[PDB]
């Protein structure tokens, strides 16, 4: 009973990938006033 929720705990699977969510954003060159 003391277990959290109804006991249907899950496991987060993965496809053997780390992920780099920055390939395409850091190529932008600042063309403004630096704000």
């Amino acid at each position: 009973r003391f277990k959290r929720s109804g006991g249907l705990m899950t496991v987060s699977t993965s496809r053997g990938e780390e992920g780099r969510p920055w390939a395409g954003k850091t190529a932008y060159i600042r063309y403004g006033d630096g704000l």
Binding site: G32, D33, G34, L35
Partner: protein
Amino acid sequence: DEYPKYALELANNGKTVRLYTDTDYYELRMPSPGNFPNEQVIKKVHHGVGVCPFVRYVNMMDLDGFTMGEVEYLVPVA
């Protein structure tokens, strides 16, 4: 209105900030983003144009202001 009354213009180099009154050209300095030292000498130029020389290119004409662009009106669908 056809032309504005008081307009503050910031140059694209981030060094000079100018205020456009009716018949004078006020010029200031912008060394850092957020300071306005009083030691600098304010430049006033009397060119002569009459009213403030700015024309507004309104996207859509509305009877109660509320001017909006074509990118804000479709944010939720995108």
